[PDB]
Amino acid sequence: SDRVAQLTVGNSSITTQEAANIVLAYGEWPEYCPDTDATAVDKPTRPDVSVNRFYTLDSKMWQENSTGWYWKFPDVLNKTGVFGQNAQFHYLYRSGFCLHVQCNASKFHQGALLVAVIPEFVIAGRGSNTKPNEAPHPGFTTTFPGTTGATFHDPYVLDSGVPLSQALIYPHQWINLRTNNCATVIVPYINAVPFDSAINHSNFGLIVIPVSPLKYSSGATTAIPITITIAPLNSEFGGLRQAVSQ
Amino acid sequence: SDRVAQLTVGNSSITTQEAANIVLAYGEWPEYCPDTDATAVDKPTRPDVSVNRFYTLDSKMWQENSTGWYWKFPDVLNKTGVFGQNAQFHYLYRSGFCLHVQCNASKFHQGALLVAVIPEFVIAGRGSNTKPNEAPHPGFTTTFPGTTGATFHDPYVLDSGVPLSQALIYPHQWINLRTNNCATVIVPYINAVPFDSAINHSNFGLIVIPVSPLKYSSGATTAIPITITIAPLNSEFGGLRQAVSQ
Amino acid sequence: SDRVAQLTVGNSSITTQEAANIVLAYGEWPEYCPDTDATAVDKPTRPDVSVNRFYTLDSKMWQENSTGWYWKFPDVLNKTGVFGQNAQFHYLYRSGFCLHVQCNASKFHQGALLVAVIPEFVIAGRGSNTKPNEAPHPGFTTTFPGTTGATFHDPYVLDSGVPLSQALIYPHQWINLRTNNCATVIVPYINAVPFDSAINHSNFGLIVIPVSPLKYSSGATTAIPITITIAPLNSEFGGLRQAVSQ
Amino acid sequence: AESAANTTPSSHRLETGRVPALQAAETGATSNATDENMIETRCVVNRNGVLETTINHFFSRSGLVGVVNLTDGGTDTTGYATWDIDIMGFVQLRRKCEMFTYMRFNAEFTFVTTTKNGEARPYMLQYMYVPPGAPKPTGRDAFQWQTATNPSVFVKLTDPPAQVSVPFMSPASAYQWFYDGYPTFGQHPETSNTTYGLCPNNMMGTFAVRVVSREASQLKLQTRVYMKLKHVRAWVPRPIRSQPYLLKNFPNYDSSKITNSARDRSSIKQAN
Amino acid sequence: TLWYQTNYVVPPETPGEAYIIAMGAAQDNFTLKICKDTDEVTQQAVL
Amino acid sequence: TLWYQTNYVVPPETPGEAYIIAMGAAQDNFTLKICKDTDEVTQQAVL
Ligand SMILES: CCCCCCCCCCCCC/C=C/[C@H](O)[C@H](N)CO
């Protein structure tokens, strides 16, 4: 009665057979903005059925020489559906997120994945140049990968100069192929400002890094996809104006 | 405490490790005939220890090109033991049945079986002739297969012109080799008459049809038998006379 | 909540995933010697933290043509640690023991082990000579194998003329590689005298005999070790004098 | 309980969850599945007794223990005939007694003495029990036969066989037939450990017998010892030996030429 | 008599030969009477 | 020290090389005192 769970948000449902306990980030539930902490005067809109649902991204084939992938979460759902449309028309934004990462295999495969969230996950340029005009900086497709995603070049340093070993302080979960096949994290709104633009500022970002490499004997299946589903819980929007893309 | 079960009827017992819930057909338990619905005047006999027990039939090797097998249940136990002897001497008969189908495999085999009961399972002849003298009709070994059993020719139409897909309205159970290895159905006495001859009328019949074919890798076991056990619960007999065979 | 167990004695701990119930030998817990049954006048010492802990012996590779191994338990810990040092200096000794035998394998290996204790397990010589001067007697390394252990020559007769089949009357436990990977027996002090020398008298002895041979397909692991851990519960020592080795 | 066990009336079950026939044997416990949790039984009031299967009714048999020869010659004479008190000389009572580890009981020793050809002539005998530590009599006219501070029995051959009662006199709290140790300290050899398994807690002295006369008596007697156990308590039950015995104080067996515990069959798929 | 109900199915890369250990005991209504000598030992070597 | 208790047994058609991830933390009686500078950085490039 602990390994099974059915999460229902809107008109979507996620059933599970091999699950650990759900993770609540920092022990705080995602709620609406109170009147004491708010600062805008205009009334925010709350669809609560059209943007609060499970959106499924693409799947990535977990190979043997894989490094890892990452995402900017207020920027992945920036163009997909009613949530993206409602976020392009508005200037302010505040919501939490519910995550679910699917990765199933047989009882003859071995491996482990580290899925965690990092608030203000800043991508660092890679180089040994200190001159201001040639210092390497990541492009826009590297900082904000969109709905597709981006890969790691040096996943041992999280592409930011911070070691992967010490990244266990964040809200994290493991996907051990002998124990479970999914990981679930519920993260609230974490920012130093009440509302913020969901276009030029990503609050946090998911990262999936295979710590133990994928191994199997010759004869089993070779395509191991990595699927991710996200539910924008308790969404609020303010400052209605023209729709901008980026 | 749900996957394990020990059924005890008479001097027989069936233990299980991989089991689903037991199925009670139409929500009615098999009981004795009341005085309001009965019509015969002579007192019926009730051994209750000599005919109410688990009788085990033969085993059939589940191959890869298998279609399916079926049985006429008041006619399979027509010659085996005290039940068959007591049914040959009597004219009237009324009992329920308890079933159990055994099919075990390893955790590297895949497949699924559909075991269900069909009241008044009438075998249809196979042909495209409408003349009365050449219209094909099934033989006696096809209508009543005996303790051995009969195979299907067109299991997609249940050998009766009714599709197998719609056969889920009957009291059924699945044998999925990754979930369980047995199926259990308890069916009461279902007929439009209180008593009836157990020689020239079969009330219902079991059918086992592999929906998903048996698949395995080269190196595992290849002999997968299909074993069936039947307990004639709450048996009654009336009209004692000479013993007839068929 | 029955298959998991964590035994803690002193500064050691044994965690388990695949476990049966713990065995308490003869339904009696190992306790201290009461004043009614005791006979010595000097006060015995009780460290209770320095000798009461899990001592791990060596590991033995379980091959396919293996016969079995055995041990003399008051003589295996005769030289290892504070327990052995405290037992060399003293003349009297009385304690119980807690056992744990580790043997793990995959879900594709098969086999079974019979681990049990035999009070006063006397090794018998092997031969057909009745003359007193040539009658074969076991050596000291065969009677008391030490911390290493000894192998069986005829494990069908337990190397003592008593059949292995009838050895199920002893406090025993099975290690079936499809059910569990460990066995646990808690045995109290069993002797006809209150105290006794732990140097020239072994109270009982463990024996591990593979009843079902180890079988596996070509491609799996081949090194299957046999690890044993012992906790000398409720130890008492008396008669302090010079330290003797054997 | 004076009877064995009564049977409760049972019936059939049609329900999930209750599995009384799936008792796991890996736990080391015995299957506790009764008949009432299985095939439908009836109500039987059993009044079969269990009194005969107790330990005091199982060890209340005499059996042969020792055979002592006494030639009493004229030119190659000895006079006396000692017999070390041990139970391992005959395999019947030994097999009946070595199915336990620790025992404690009393004795009812009985002495049946016959002649070579078999004849009860009125010759008076003297049965002496020499405790461990006492000097043994050396000769039919020795100093030790005075039996001062020493129990002895005077009986003739025409009399009924003598019978005395013997208490529990081991220095330990109970006897033992299997001693996994050594009697003394020191370095033990690797060639021939002839002192392994020896228990000093079982040497119950020596039993001697002579013929009470002056000159001699040309007769070869043959005494038999019958020991009846009583007030017996046993601990730690041990399996029964399946191999033939070879020595008295050692459970040695044949390495080659092994005796199987069950005889051979025609095939495994055949009951007869 | 021990019969094969369905089959002994086995996946690939797995040995297809197992074993069954048979145990035996007595229930609570087990009763014995009239003591006699066993027939497992008839002769004996002089010890 | 991490020792091998019995063995690492593996069935056929299964890789025979696994890995163990070691984690570390502190209990509730963990106590620190006397603040000083770290020795993980000694020099630095002019930023
Ligand atoms: C007056 C003559 C009496 C003759 C009997 C001697 C009395 C002492 C008998 C002691 C009874 C001992 C019974 C067995 C003891 C030890 O277990 C055996 N020696 C070893 O098998």
mmCIF file of C-alpha atoms and ligand atoms in Angstrom, chain D residues 83-88 105-107 109 111 127-129 151-153 164 166-167 169 175-177 201-204 206-207 225 227 249, ligand 1:
data_model
loop_
_atom_site.group_PDB
_atom_site.id
_atom_site.type_symbol
_atom_site.label_atom_id
_atom_site.label_comp_id
_atom_site.label_asym_id
_atom_site.label_seq_id
_atom_site.Cartn_x
_atom_site.Cartn_y
_atom_site.Cartn_z
ATOM 1 C CA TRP D 83 34.409 -56.440 34.634
ATOM 2 C CA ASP D 84 34.646 -52.681 33.821
ATOM 3 C CA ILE D 85 31.080 -51.280 34.228
ATOM 4 C CA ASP D 86 30.139 -49.939 30.782
ATOM 5 C CA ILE D 87 27.035 -50.143 28.604
ATOM 6 C CA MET D 88 28.736 -50.021 25.187
ATOM 7 C CA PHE D 105 18.783 -42.790 35.937
ATOM 8 C CA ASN D 106 19.126 -45.583 38.494
ATOM 9 C CA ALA D 107 19.996 -49.242 37.993
ATOM 10 C CA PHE D 109 21.619 -54.889 38.138
ATOM 11 C CA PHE D 111 23.408 -61.431 37.876
ATOM 12 C CA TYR D 127 30.045 -60.409 43.854
ATOM 13 C CA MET D 128 32.170 -57.372 44.730
ATOM 14 C CA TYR D 129 31.770 -53.796 43.492
ATOM 15 C CA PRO D 151 29.537 -53.573 49.422
ATOM 16 C CA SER D 152 29.399 -57.197 48.320
ATOM 17 C CA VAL D 153 26.770 -59.886 47.755
ATOM 18 C CA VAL D 164 20.595 -54.903 43.785
ATOM 19 C CA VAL D 166 22.218 -48.709 42.241
ATOM 20 C CA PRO D 167 21.816 -44.922 42.656
ATOM 21 C CA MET D 169 26.713 -41.616 41.373
ATOM 22 C CA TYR D 175 25.584 -38.930 32.286
ATOM 23 C CA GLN D 176 26.698 -38.369 28.708
ATOM 24 C CA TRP D 177 27.450 -40.783 25.874
ATOM 25 C CA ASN D 201 32.378 -38.878 34.365
ATOM 26 C CA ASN D 202 31.369 -42.409 33.314
ATOM 27 C CA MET D 203 34.005 -44.705 34.875
ATOM 28 C CA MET D 204 31.831 -46.493 37.451
ATOM 29 C CA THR D 206 35.095 -52.307 38.480
ATOM 30 C CA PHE D 207 33.002 -55.400 39.235
ATOM 31 C CA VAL D 225 24.722 -58.755 33.783
ATOM 32 C CA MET D 227 20.675 -53.752 34.112
ATOM 33 C CA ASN D 249 34.186 -46.356 23.475
HETATM 34 C C1 LIG G 1 27.281 -55.365 44.358
HETATM 35 C C2 LIG G 1 27.576 -55.434 42.864
HETATM 36 C C3 LIG G 1 26.883 -54.306 42.107
HETATM 37 C C4 LIG G 1 27.238 -54.349 40.625
HETATM 38 C C5 LIG G 1 26.875 -53.048 39.918
HETATM 39 C C6 LIG G 1 27.892 -51.957 40.224
HETATM 40 C C7 LIG G 1 27.264 -50.735 40.881
HETATM 41 C C8 LIG G 1 27.640 -49.458 40.138
HETATM 42 C C9 LIG G 1 26.867 -49.356 38.834
HETATM 43 C C10 LIG G 1 26.798 -47.920 38.344
HETATM 44 C C11 LIG G 1 25.742 -47.787 37.255
HETATM 45 C C12 LIG G 1 26.382 -47.149 36.033
HETATM 46 C C13 LIG G 1 25.546 -47.319 34.775
HETATM 47 C C14 LIG G 1 26.382 -46.835 33.615
HETATM 48 C C15 LIG G 1 27.488 -45.891 33.841
HETATM 49 C C16 LIG G 1 28.220 -45.308 32.671
HETATM 50 O O1 LIG G 1 27.291 -44.637 31.858
HETATM 51 C C17 LIG G 1 28.884 -46.424 31.880
HETATM 52 N N1 LIG G 1 29.977 -46.946 32.678
HETATM 53 C C18 LIG G 1 29.407 -45.929 30.540
HETATM 54 O O2 LIG G 1 28.605 -46.456 29.506
#
